């Protein structure tokens, strides 16, 4: 039982998606973080609309970007999002489409993480599920990043402007990190995924704007 988990072992993560070129990271976030829920509480694992989230959302930009929480509480007033299968994704702002039909999950609503505290979202990654992060993925480091446990003293923890998903955490080589998954296709990082350091003073900002949905 060593200090480690990965949801990807227990099937409660989806595929890697790519996002493509609309600002819909935060769209993916939030379906991650409720497809992780989605499995707890019924035991199926499937894909949900992130589409649903940028037509709908409209506390958000669409491509323009948005909040999970803002998502979270959307699926929660709508009661339901659809899954992808019955809201596919195109990759632009369209008008709500959303189908009651399609409905596969909602939520009672989210908790957010209290700003900076990494051990509130390794605690809640541990016994709730996936949690969606906001991070600083400016630097041209983050982008070319291929293996190891990433961590680069300029990420600006104050300069949040991407939305991913947090799978996990454990230790590479004496390394805590945080297993993250992306939203920028399996060809990105390492098959879509990103060792983030931990317990480094809170780099890239990864726990200045963390939530999950409640189901
Ligand atoms: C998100 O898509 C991340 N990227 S990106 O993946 O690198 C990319 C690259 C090229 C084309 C599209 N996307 C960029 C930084 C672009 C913006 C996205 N970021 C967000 O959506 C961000 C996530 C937060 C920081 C967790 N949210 C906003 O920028 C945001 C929040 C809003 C609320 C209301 C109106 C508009 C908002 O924008």
């Given at each position: 039982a060593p200090d480690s988990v990965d949801y990807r072992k227990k099937g409660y993560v989806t595929p890697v998606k790519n996002q493509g070129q609309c600002g819909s990271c935060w769209a993916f976030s939030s379906v991650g973080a409720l497809e992780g829920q989605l499995k707890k509480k019924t035991g199926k694992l499937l894909n949900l609309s992130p589409q649903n989230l940028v037509d709908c959302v409209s506390e958000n930009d669409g491509c323009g970007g948005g909040y999970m929480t803002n998502a979270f509480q959307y699926v929660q007033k709508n009661r339901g999002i659809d899954s992808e299968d019955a809201y596919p994704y195109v990759g632009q702002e369209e008008s709500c489409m959303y189908n009651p039909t399609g409905k596969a999950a909602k939520c009672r609503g989210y908790r957010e993480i209290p700003e900076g505290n990494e051990k509130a979202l390794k605690r809640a990654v541990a016994r709730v599920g996936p949690v969606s992060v906001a991070i600083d993925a400016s630097l041209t480091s983050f982008q070319?990043?291929?293996?190891?446990?990433?961590?680069?003293?300029?990420?600006?923890?104050?300069?949040?402007?991407?939305?991913?998903?947090?799978?996990?955490?454990?230790?590479?080589?004496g390394n805590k990190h945080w297993i993250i998954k992306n939203s920028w296709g399996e060809n990105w990082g390492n098959k879509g995924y990103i060792l983030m350091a931990?317990?480094?003073?809170?780099?890239?900002?990864?726990a200045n704007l963390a939530s999950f949905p409640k189901m």
């Open positions: 070319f990043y291929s293996k190891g446990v990433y961590y680069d003293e300029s990420c600006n923890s104050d300069n949040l402007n991407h939305a991913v998903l947090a799978v996990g955490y454990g230790i590479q080589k931990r317990n480094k003073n809170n780099a890239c900002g990864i």
